[PDB]
Amino acid sequence: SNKDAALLEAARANNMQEVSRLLSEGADVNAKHRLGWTALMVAAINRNNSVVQVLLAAGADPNLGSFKGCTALHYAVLADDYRTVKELLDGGANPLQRNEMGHTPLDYAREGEVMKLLRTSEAKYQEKQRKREAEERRRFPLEQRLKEHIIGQESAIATVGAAIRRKENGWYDEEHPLVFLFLGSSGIGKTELAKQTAKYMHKDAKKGFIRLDMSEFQERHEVAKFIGSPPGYVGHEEGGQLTKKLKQCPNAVVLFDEVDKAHPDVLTIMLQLFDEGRLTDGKGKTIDCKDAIFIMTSNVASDEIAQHALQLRQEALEMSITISKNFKENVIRPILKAHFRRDEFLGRINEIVYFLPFCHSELIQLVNKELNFWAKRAKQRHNITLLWDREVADVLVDGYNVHYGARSIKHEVERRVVNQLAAAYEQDLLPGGCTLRITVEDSDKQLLKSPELPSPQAEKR
Amino acid sequence: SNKDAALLEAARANNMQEVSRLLSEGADVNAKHRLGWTALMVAAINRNNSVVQVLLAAGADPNLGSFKGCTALHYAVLADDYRTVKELLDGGANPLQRNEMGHTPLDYAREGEVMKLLRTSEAKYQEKQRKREAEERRRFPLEQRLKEHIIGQESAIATVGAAIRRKENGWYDEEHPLVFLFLGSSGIGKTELAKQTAKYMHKDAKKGFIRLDMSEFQERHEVAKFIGSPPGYVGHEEGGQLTKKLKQCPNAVVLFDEVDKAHPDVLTIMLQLFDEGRLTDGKGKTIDCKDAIFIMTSNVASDEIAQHALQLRQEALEMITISKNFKENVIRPILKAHFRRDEFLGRINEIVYFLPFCHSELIQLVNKELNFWAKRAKQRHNITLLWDREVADVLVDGYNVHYGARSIKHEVERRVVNQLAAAYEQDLLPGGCTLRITVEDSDKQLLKSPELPSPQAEKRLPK
Amino acid sequence: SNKDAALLEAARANNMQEVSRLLSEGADVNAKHRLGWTALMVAAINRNNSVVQVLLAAGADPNLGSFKGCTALHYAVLADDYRTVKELLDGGANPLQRNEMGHTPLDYAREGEVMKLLRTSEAKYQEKQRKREAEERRRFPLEQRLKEHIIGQESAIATVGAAIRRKENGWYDEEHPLVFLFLGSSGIGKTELAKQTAKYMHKDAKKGFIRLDMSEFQERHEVAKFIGSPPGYVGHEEGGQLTKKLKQCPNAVVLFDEVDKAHPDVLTIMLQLFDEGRLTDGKGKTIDCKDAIFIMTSNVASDEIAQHALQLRQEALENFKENVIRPILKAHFRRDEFLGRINEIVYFLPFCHSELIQLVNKELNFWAKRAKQRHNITLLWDREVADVLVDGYNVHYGARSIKHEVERRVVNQLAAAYEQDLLPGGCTLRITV
Ligand SMILES: Nc1ncnc2c1ncn2[C@@H]1O[C@H](COP(=O)(O)OP(=O)(O)OP(O)(O)=S)[C@@H](O)[C@H]1O
Ligand SMILES: Nc1ncnc2c1ncn2[C@@H]1O[C@H](COP(=O)(O)OP(=O)(O)OP(O)(O)=S)[C@@H](O)[C@H]1O
Ligand SMILES: [Mg+2]
Ligand SMILES: [Mg+2]
């Protein structure tokens, strides 16, 4: 309490030393005096440009509120201090924010540099969105980014990108949120594609990617987690995780991993959310999520999809490829109808994305990706150069298992190669060119920059 | 708040007695003065070695952040007091600790005792790192540690040791936990190996080893134990149990003993845990246990594994523990069809197979049990216990394959320890008690006194 | 209570300043004195015309209920002040509302302008009622009403209209609930006809519509949703899905979206819906369904119409009513109870080429106008594009197939062109395939 009053007085008195010391020592930057003025506003009204600058550096809010409701920008423009107004605008001050009396800083601003600064800030705010729109669609389509992380699944990537672009440009039913369903065998990038899409939509914003694993919603009462308990009940003050996260980021990508595990009541709530487009928490607040993107992953028809894709590959080899026809989708549909038992739920789904089991070339690409990851990790951590040959890739892919997808290749690479590297690391490995070779059927290693097979550090003795 | 001010004033005055009294009363050891100095900081700047000693004894933190963001070590070094700097370093102060401006205590030190002491502490940190690395280079007994407690199962030991070594030396993806599944007959060391691995990884730390008896999760709704109840239901405030335990020790060894007893819908929750090591409790908090180790024990393919091992050993007897495609053709359809989904098995890094003991391994088990009992007798009653090879043969004759080492354990308890406990009624004294086979070869065995020429008496129960 | 007392005293004394201050401070405009009279009532009896005006502007209700139970209109009329009565009526006061003693304001009114004003308000109410009746009469022919927003299904529309007229005109068993079973494939206007029927019959917004998916109703969900989990059961969702909405609109149009997927228990409880209705709610309330409209639907009989196409081809286009009496339905749904009580069965026919192309055209028109930069919309070859689209004929699950055809062959192309910045304005279509 004393520190806050001292900071307020220092801001009023334009005391650079006191303000800096209090801010560095943990004093609340936005401490509010009983008269309604914080350090930033008292600094702005008194033309304390240095105090305003230091407060902004510490995290002061220039948009935080007769001058009732006047923010720091309002007082800075009132004081006719162009430097203070510019500094506050640099901190995110809104030149059109209205105080309790409805007066914006522009209205309080006197003709001169203050008005120009406010107009420039408003123009920058307006044109930032245009710049983002121009940059997003150019030189970096979603498909381009996805192809970096995902191997194969070209049709799925194209479908997702086309749908996303349609939503972005408005050539779509903007009255309803965009909904996807991902199907296929295991270990083929459903969750991976969803995560990459979320990252691309929201860059690095964690709040932009709401992750829900439906395996926790196998019971009827689990729906409470979406919206929280009703008033007066245990934990009602937390109105569900989903509602809070959505209101934090309306256009967040929502992933319901393994949706098939969810209890039917949960699916009913999901369908209500999709059709309505907004959800009401347990506190009576309703949150609009029309622009949100919902992605669902499951393996309900995985076996049918996989065996049909393998049959189509074999049929194409009789011509010597895999484009699954809509009739196979009609054949699959009854399975989905039986599992979900909600014909409206399936109909509400905007897109069904099918992932195919990998072909041999895609397995080779997967093995190469894993080896590259391990090689770069070794180079970074221990300055070890790792090399391999096509034969090594063939040998590793020989361990592939269709029922597990990329996970099988990952585990095979780890056990066959990485185990040897770890065993030899403590004593033999050093910076240089370590190359993997095949003797007859097993993977062997070569000495750094020399064709000498390292002696394995036989455990025990 | 007056207690904090009094403690700060006492510390700045080099008053050990007042500082101790304030600390005992309940004054915060890390109380911060309005000028940024804490009690330890003001003690250090004034060369108050006794004050620093008493503050550290109460739990003072010398690494807490122009003197902006400085540390008690910085102030002690600035005053150039060897004793105060030494005490602060002994209390956890780091000469590599950096203040707001980035200055380290080494920088503040002037040539003399303080500079040498700070260099010594920096070398202590660096050599701690290097010596941990050197030990890890030497730390290759995990196979030895296991073989101390486990007999046979060489393939399982090798697999687990290789995976653990890989994880320990880096060389492992941090985006996915490490998962094992242990398969085989009953009483062959699955749970034993899991417990030994947990002990090795976390020494004696109880929080480091998390145990779950999946036989208690035979119902779909029982999954709530992992994550707790949702908001508005009994026990919601408590939250998940497994989530709490994982929060305590993120890198703990998790053991789902007898997992095939669980309802498949309960196993369903393990998909995320095994893939990304993330679980969200009933309150919506993720635990992010990426670097934990998950071990599952089950006997689903017990009969197939045992039969295949017996057949392989019979074949090898013509003139050892390898199965290449037998796993995929035979074991996999069992595991998948009767209990699991494909995606669940896809997340398991390694499947470990335990095979039934060979005859020599049975002899080793019998010797292990006899050694355990002899150790107990010597340690407690100062009784030395001896036996012969024929004793081991007779004991192993009672071995039962369906029960594994438990059969031998019970046999030893039944046919030997019962006689030892009955002889312990004043017929056992601290001498070389010897166990021998009677004239009836492979039929009976008796105890002999400290002096071997005398057999132990009838135990005279029907008094 | 202090604010209410102050407002009441100010209204009684005609203190405009005090009334305004109390209203601006949040005092209840409809504050009720312990003796039964409110601020508006006392202002009215005292001829405080300005106080009544300001109270009404603040939201005062002049219909709030020996003068016990008298409304503000009653008190203004008793005071014989024309201005106060006019102001109260302007706010919605009813000149015929009775107090607890059964005395209307007209009875309290004395000869003068008050009589004329109260009778004018009564005439306004009567004219409103007559206007609603005339609008409902003009709603006929309901066949045209439905055809305004539906394509095809003329037979079903005519049947529904005739049944509605018969029930309205007393030529039906009005004592018994009214129930249709709708038969055919999915997505052929069943839900569209039910929704249009609800929109037209009920005044607006389909407030009286009630549609449910009987596929989610099972032994574990029958009472918890259909009747709604009553008190003392696992869950407290009384009403659940059906009777929670029937509490407001007893004459609801109620759609059950697949009886092939309905549970035997729910199909049995649905037996209450017939005879007299009065279906038990989770709260225990029962609704007389003799006036309600139930629309069961199924696809189990979807073949009976599609396989023939005679009911469509031979219905005066260029078969017979109940060509086979309940062919599959009796064996499946126990005609003795469930279908024996159904008053009528409505067939739904596969969409014709003309109907399909009309749907395509309407969807394309929507998309054209849906365009934000409509200047770029030319719709050149729209008829030909529709001809191409209908090639993917709806023979699978309903008009949603045609909607997906339109989305695939049109929307994607336009989005791609927009992304390629090839749409400045005056843009034609493209004939693919
Ligand atoms: N198409 C892919 N390209 C590159 N890596 C992939 C691909 N698919 C999977 N992976 C990797 O292998 C791992 C497998 O996990 P997922 O892709 O998310 O499983 P899935 O394909 O969705 O099938 P389920 O859900 O287990 S039945 C991922 O974490 C990826 O790192
Ligand atoms: N040296 C050893 N080698 C193998 N097993 C041992 C050894 N020493 C002790 N055990 C026994 O191993 C048993 C635990 O192993 P488990 O394989 O989990 O048996 P289990 O619990 O019956 O297995 P299942 O899965 O339930 S069939 C305990 O009875 C231990 O006493
Ligand atoms: Mg996944
Ligand atoms: Mg066990």
mmCIF file of N, CA, C and O in Angstrom, chain C residues 253-286:
data_model
loop_
_atom_site.group_PDB
_atom_site.id
_atom_site.type_symbol
_atom_site.label_atom_id
_atom_site.label_comp_id
_atom_site.label_asym_id
_atom_site.label_seq_id
_atom_site.Cartn_x
_atom_site.Cartn_y
_atom_site.Cartn_z
ATOM 1 N N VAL C 253 -46.597 -28.622 -33.414
ATOM 2 C CA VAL C 253 -46.220 -29.545 -34.485
ATOM 3 C C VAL C 253 -44.948 -30.231 -34.012
ATOM 4 O O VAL C 253 -43.924 -29.572 -33.837
ATOM 5 N N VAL C 254 -45.017 -31.528 -33.743
ATOM 6 C CA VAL C 254 -43.928 -32.287 -33.126
ATOM 7 C C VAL C 254 -43.424 -33.365 -34.072
ATOM 8 O O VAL C 254 -44.167 -34.268 -34.443
ATOM 9 N N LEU C 255 -42.148 -33.290 -34.431
ATOM 10 C CA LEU C 255 -41.485 -34.155 -35.395
ATOM 11 C C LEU C 255 -40.614 -35.196 -34.679
ATOM 12 O O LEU C 255 -39.709 -34.830 -33.935
ATOM 13 N N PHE C 256 -40.828 -36.477 -34.964
ATOM 14 C CA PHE C 256 -39.965 -37.577 -34.531
ATOM 15 C C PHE C 256 -39.213 -38.133 -35.745
ATOM 16 O O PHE C 256 -39.805 -38.678 -36.679
ATOM 17 N N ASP C 257 -37.895 -37.983 -35.753
ATOM 18 C CA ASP C 257 -37.130 -38.003 -37.002
ATOM 19 C C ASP C 257 -36.744 -39.398 -37.528
ATOM 20 O O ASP C 257 -36.275 -39.505 -38.655
ATOM 21 N N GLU C 258 -36.906 -40.467 -36.741
ATOM 22 C CA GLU C 258 -36.782 -41.835 -37.259
ATOM 23 C C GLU C 258 -37.349 -42.882 -36.289
ATOM 24 O O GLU C 258 -36.678 -43.272 -35.332
ATOM 25 N N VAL C 259 -38.561 -43.390 -36.520
ATOM 26 C CA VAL C 259 -39.083 -44.472 -35.669
ATOM 27 C C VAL C 259 -38.364 -45.813 -35.874
ATOM 28 O O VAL C 259 -38.323 -46.607 -34.940
ATOM 29 N N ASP C 260 -37.682 -46.058 -36.997
ATOM 30 C CA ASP C 260 -36.829 -47.247 -37.188
ATOM 31 C C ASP C 260 -35.708 -47.342 -36.141
ATOM 32 O O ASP C 260 -35.257 -48.435 -35.799
ATOM 33 N N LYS C 261 -35.257 -46.194 -35.622
ATOM 34 C CA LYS C 261 -34.202 -46.096 -34.611
ATOM 35 C C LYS C 261 -34.759 -45.821 -33.206
ATOM 36 O O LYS C 261 -33.999 -45.861 -32.244
ATOM 37 N N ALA C 262 -36.070 -45.597 -33.073
ATOM 38 C CA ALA C 262 -36.739 -45.418 -31.787
ATOM 39 C C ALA C 262 -36.793 -46.713 -30.966
ATOM 40 O O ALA C 262 -36.977 -47.808 -31.499
ATOM 41 N N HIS C 263 -36.641 -46.578 -29.648
ATOM 42 C CA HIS C 263 -36.577 -47.716 -28.748
ATOM 43 C C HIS C 263 -37.989 -48.227 -28.463
ATOM 44 O O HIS C 263 -38.944 -47.441 -28.462
ATOM 45 N N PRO C 264 -38.168 -49.530 -28.238
ATOM 46 C CA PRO C 264 -39.520 -50.023 -27.928
ATOM 47 C C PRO C 264 -40.159 -49.319 -26.744
ATOM 48 O O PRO C 264 -41.372 -49.084 -26.750
ATOM 49 N N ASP C 265 -39.374 -48.974 -25.722
ATOM 50 C CA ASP C 265 -39.926 -48.281 -24.563
ATOM 51 C C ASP C 265 -40.459 -46.904 -24.941
ATOM 52 O O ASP C 265 -41.560 -46.524 -24.527
ATOM 53 N N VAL C 266 -39.693 -46.137 -25.720
ATOM 54 C CA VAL C 266 -40.176 -44.826 -26.136
ATOM 55 C C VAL C 266 -41.350 -44.970 -27.094
ATOM 56 O O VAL C 266 -42.297 -44.177 -27.050
ATOM 57 N N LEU C 267 -41.395 -46.009 -27.931
ATOM 58 C CA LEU C 267 -42.505 -46.200 -28.850
ATOM 59 C C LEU C 267 -43.754 -46.566 -28.053
ATOM 60 O O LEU C 267 -44.860 -46.192 -28.426
ATOM 61 N N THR C 268 -43.588 -47.248 -26.922
ATOM 62 C CA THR C 268 -44.725 -47.539 -26.056
ATOM 63 C C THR C 268 -45.200 -46.286 -25.329
ATOM 64 O O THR C 268 -46.405 -46.038 -25.221
ATOM 65 N N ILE C 269 -44.264 -45.485 -24.813
ATOM 66 C CA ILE C 269 -44.674 -44.292 -24.078
ATOM 67 C C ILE C 269 -45.361 -43.310 -25.016
ATOM 68 O O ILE C 269 -46.254 -42.562 -24.599
ATOM 69 N N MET C 270 -44.962 -43.298 -26.295
ATOM 70 C CA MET C 270 -45.606 -42.529 -27.344
ATOM 71 C C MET C 270 -47.071 -42.942 -27.508
ATOM 72 O O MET C 270 -47.861 -42.175 -28.037
ATOM 73 N N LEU C 271 -47.483 -44.105 -27.002
ATOM 74 C CA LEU C 271 -48.883 -44.510 -27.058
ATOM 75 C C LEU C 271 -49.760 -43.568 -26.246
ATOM 76 O O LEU C 271 -50.943 -43.395 -26.558
ATOM 77 N N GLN C 272 -49.199 -42.948 -25.204
ATOM 78 C CA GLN C 272 -49.931 -41.918 -24.478
ATOM 79 C C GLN C 272 -50.306 -40.760 -25.388
ATOM 80 O O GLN C 272 -51.365 -40.147 -25.211
ATOM 81 N N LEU C 273 -49.477 -40.421 -26.396
ATOM 82 C CA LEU C 273 -49.678 -39.263 -27.292
ATOM 83 C C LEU C 273 -51.005 -39.305 -28.053
ATOM 84 O O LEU C 273 -51.533 -38.258 -28.420
ATOM 85 N N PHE C 274 -51.499 -40.511 -28.325
ATOM 86 C CA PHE C 274 -52.802 -40.795 -28.920
ATOM 87 C C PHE C 274 -53.885 -40.909 -27.840
ATOM 88 O O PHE C 274 -53.593 -40.603 -26.696
ATOM 89 N N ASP C 275 -55.105 -41.377 -28.160
ATOM 90 C CA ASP C 275 -56.231 -41.532 -27.247
ATOM 91 C C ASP C 275 -56.652 -40.173 -26.705
ATOM 92 O O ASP C 275 -57.688 -39.628 -27.101
ATOM 93 N N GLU C 276 -55.847 -39.620 -25.797
ATOM 94 C CA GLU C 276 -56.068 -38.284 -25.266
ATOM 95 C C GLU C 276 -54.797 -37.456 -25.177
ATOM 96 O O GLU C 276 -54.870 -36.296 -24.758
ATOM 97 N N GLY C 277 -53.643 -37.975 -25.595
ATOM 98 C CA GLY C 277 -52.385 -37.310 -25.346
ATOM 99 C C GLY C 277 -52.037 -37.374 -23.873
ATOM 100 O O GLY C 277 -51.884 -38.435 -23.276
ATOM 101 N N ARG C 278 -51.945 -36.205 -23.242
ATOM 102 C CA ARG C 278 -51.676 -36.123 -21.809
ATOM 103 C C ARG C 278 -50.389 -36.852 -21.439
ATOM 104 O O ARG C 278 -50.293 -37.459 -20.370
ATOM 105 N N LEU C 279 -49.382 -36.817 -22.325
ATOM 106 C CA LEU C 279 -48.102 -37.486 -22.082
ATOM 107 C C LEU C 279 -47.515 -36.977 -20.770
ATOM 108 O O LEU C 279 -47.494 -35.772 -20.530
ATOM 109 N N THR C 280 -47.034 -37.886 -19.936
ATOM 110 C CA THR C 280 -46.465 -37.515 -18.648
ATOM 111 C C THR C 280 -45.135 -36.798 -18.853
ATOM 112 O O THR C 280 -44.271 -37.274 -19.597
ATOM 113 N N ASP C 281 -44.978 -35.654 -18.195
ATOM 114 C CA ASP C 281 -43.719 -34.929 -18.211
ATOM 115 C C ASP C 281 -42.879 -35.322 -17.002
ATOM 116 O O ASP C 281 -43.384 -35.876 -16.022
ATOM 117 N N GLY C 282 -41.579 -35.030 -17.079
ATOM 118 C CA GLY C 282 -40.720 -35.236 -15.928
ATOM 119 C C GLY C 282 -41.152 -34.443 -14.715
ATOM 120 O O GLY C 282 -40.856 -34.841 -13.583
ATOM 121 N N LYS C 283 -41.845 -33.325 -14.925
ATOM 122 C CA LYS C 283 -42.441 -32.559 -13.840
ATOM 123 C C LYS C 283 -43.834 -33.052 -13.473
ATOM 124 O O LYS C 283 -44.451 -32.491 -12.559
ATOM 125 N N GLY C 284 -44.343 -34.077 -14.157
ATOM 126 C CA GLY C 284 -45.663 -34.604 -13.900
ATOM 127 C C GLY C 284 -46.774 -33.976 -14.713
ATOM 128 O O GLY C 284 -47.913 -34.454 -14.647
ATOM 129 N N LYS C 285 -46.486 -32.925 -15.476
ATOM 130 C CA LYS C 285 -47.524 -32.262 -16.252
ATOM 131 C C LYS C 285 -47.904 -33.100 -17.467
ATOM 132 O O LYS C 285 -47.055 -33.745 -18.090
ATOM 133 N N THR C 286 -49.191 -33.087 -17.798
ATOM 134 C CA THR C 286 -49.728 -33.806 -18.943
ATOM 135 C C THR C 286 -50.424 -32.822 -19.872
ATOM 136 O O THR C 286 -51.125 -31.914 -19.416
#
